[PDB]
Amino acid sequence: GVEVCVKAAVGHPDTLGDSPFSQRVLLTLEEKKVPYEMKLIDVQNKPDWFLKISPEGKVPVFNGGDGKWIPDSDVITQVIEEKYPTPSLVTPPEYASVGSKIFSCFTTFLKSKDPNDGSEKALLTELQALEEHLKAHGPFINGQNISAADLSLAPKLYHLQVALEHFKGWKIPEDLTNVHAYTEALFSRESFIKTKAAKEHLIAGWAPKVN
Numbered sequence: 001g002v003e004v005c006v007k008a009a010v011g012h013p014d015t016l017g018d019s020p021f022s023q024r025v026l027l028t029l030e031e032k033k034v035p036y037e038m039k040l041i042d043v044q045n046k047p048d049w050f051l052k053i054s055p056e057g058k059v060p061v062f063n064g065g066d067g068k069w070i071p072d073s074d075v076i077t078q079v080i081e082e083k084y085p086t087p088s089l090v091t092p093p094e095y096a097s098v099g100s101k102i103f104s105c106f107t108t109f110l111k112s113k114d115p116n117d118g119s120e121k122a123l124l125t126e127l128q129a130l131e132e133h134l135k136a137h138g139p140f141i142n143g144q145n146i147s148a149a150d151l152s153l154a155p156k157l158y159h160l161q162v163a164l165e166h167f168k169g170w171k172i173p174e175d176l177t178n179v180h181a182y183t184e185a186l187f188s189r190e191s192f193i194k195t196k197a198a199k200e201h202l203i204a205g206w207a208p209k210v211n
């Protein structure tokens, strides 16, 4: 029986939290139609049973039914890919780094309290790179079929959209039309709706880090 431990919403131990890494794992299981049990962990009050199988307190951790719990969403999604090959979510190596700097740039811009430090511009450069890629090879990162890269990137774009609009009133420019089509499509997938954090909980997660 497949099981995954993931972070709960801050202050709400029985509600899904907002880790994009955990969401990547949950999306992978959902899209592959793999039945799983989800255990929510209050990462500010971890239970001892959890500390025993995850001694460093890491989440997500995944139990594939083979008598062990493994961390790291990169690794976990590879294990799931190998165990449940169909639908294939393999992203070709040539596109594996598409969008790879968007999240770090987003977090730097979010936390910046200087409008002129170039953090916005850096983020825009990465979004424009995503735009050109989707333009030439969309609608997903690898064209017609959804793949791993999408399930890694979409959770991170969700954070970007929600947090930047809330805390800075900032939106991805409307002229990046392929990026907008991309986020509208990914965020409205059944799997995404099922596995995302309610926006107020994601905002609560970021609030102490913004100020």
Ligand SMILES: N[C@@H](CCC(=O)N[C@@H](CS)C(=O)NCC(=O)O)C(=O)O
Pocket (backbone or CB within 6 Å): 018, 019, 020, 107, 108, 111, 201, 202, 204, 205, 206, 209
């Ligand atoms: N300033 C850190 C925030 C703390 C952190 O370790 N991870 C982030 C990105 S997942 C986080 O937990 N943000 C609050 C949240 O996701 O609710 C960052 O930019 O990554």
Ligand SMILES: [Ca+2]
Pocket (backbone or CB within 6 Å): 197, 198, 199, 200
């Ligand atoms: Ca919501």
